[PDB]
Amino acid sequence: AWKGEVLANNEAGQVTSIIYNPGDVITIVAAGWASYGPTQKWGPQGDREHPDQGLICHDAFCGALVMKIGNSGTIPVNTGLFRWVAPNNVQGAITLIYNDVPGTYGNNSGSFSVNIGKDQS
Amino acid sequence: AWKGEVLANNEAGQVTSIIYNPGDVITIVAAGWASYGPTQKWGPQGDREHPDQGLICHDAFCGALVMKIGNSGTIPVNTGLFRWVAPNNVQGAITLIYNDVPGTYGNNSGSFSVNIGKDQS
């Protein structure tokens, strides 16, 4: 499995050691507090009251945890995924990213602690 | 494996089908939005800015997800637990509960979608 920290100000995202392969079943658990600028902080689900001003992932609130598997587009992770299987043709290294508008990561703070494990399959 | 919702206004708590046994390893994932009264809603980690006014679990914020195992005291769940082992002598059915002051659940709203599974060991 993989365990690490995903910083809110890390625009490129945090590359994990998990390489999702076809047929793999994975489980993710995320926790912690982060912010997209304001002094207030939000959990892995982000800010439910903030407008989407061009986030890297439109299927998740601003300040939420999302991911990219290999070359895929962003995928919502939020508080995590339970025994999850990726869509067809989706594979490669897993990168965890804080959901924010491109180019604005500079004033971000906090981070999410995340566990990723492969389940039986 | 168990999946269900935990209503915030349910003071008694949501009983699952999971019976934790000595040596068991479990993984929990929780998501959703709930409130301990205010119009705003918080994730499974609760409101980090709200004071503790006699919560059922002092190890977690008001509005966070907690649990009891058999006759044990409240245990912080928050966003979930990754391949987690219970303390010695802790066993029995797992009951998921919204962290709030007893007798005040009346004005709660929302719920959490929670998954619980047993891992290999």
Added chain:
Amino acid sequence: AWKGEVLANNEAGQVTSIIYNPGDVITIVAAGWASYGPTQKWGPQGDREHPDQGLICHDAFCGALVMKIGNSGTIPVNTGLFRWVAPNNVQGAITLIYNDVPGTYGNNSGSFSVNIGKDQS
């Protein structure tokens, strides 16, 4: 997980540290060579040609690996079990036993090496 040897001459059987609980999914892999008397040896499947002269397990060949969960009847194991679930709520420690006629274990030789682990459930 549990790993150990099961001697063919051990009539009482080999008690393991595995405590099977209702709902548990288990996997077992047995290997090795043993005999119920003759000079040659057989695998965990036993002797497919030998007649049943009053074996402790009538659902398995003589010289095969069987087991008991708690105080239940014997259960065929053979080469092992793959993600196996018990016949409705059989509970207790797992005892591995060489399949032979009671009171004749005296001239047995060899043993089986066995791994037992609980799977995700």
Added chain:
Amino acid sequence: AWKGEVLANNEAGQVTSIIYNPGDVITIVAAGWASYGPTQKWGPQGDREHPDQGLICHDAFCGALVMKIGNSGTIPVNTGLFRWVAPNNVQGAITLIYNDVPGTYGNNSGSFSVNIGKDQS
């Protein structure tokens, strides 16, 4: 997870749907009766008394179950493998093969019933 039969007379071997990947942990359980010629039949461990006359796998008895992972050499399987990790660089589809001398599979009979699964990691 894969489940199928491996015929003793299939020299090419049986291709499974299991693609082994770096870091993968797998469990195999094999059962049944097969023969490399004689009218007798042996289990997945083969004939412990038979000499090696040029078997595809010199680390297992004749009549034993073995496998190939991708372009790797033969690897002993016998009754199976418990939470097993492959040697470095070894990866690719898993092909199950009956252990025998090349060009002699003609007079073989029987088969092995095999279950392959991936464990959590």
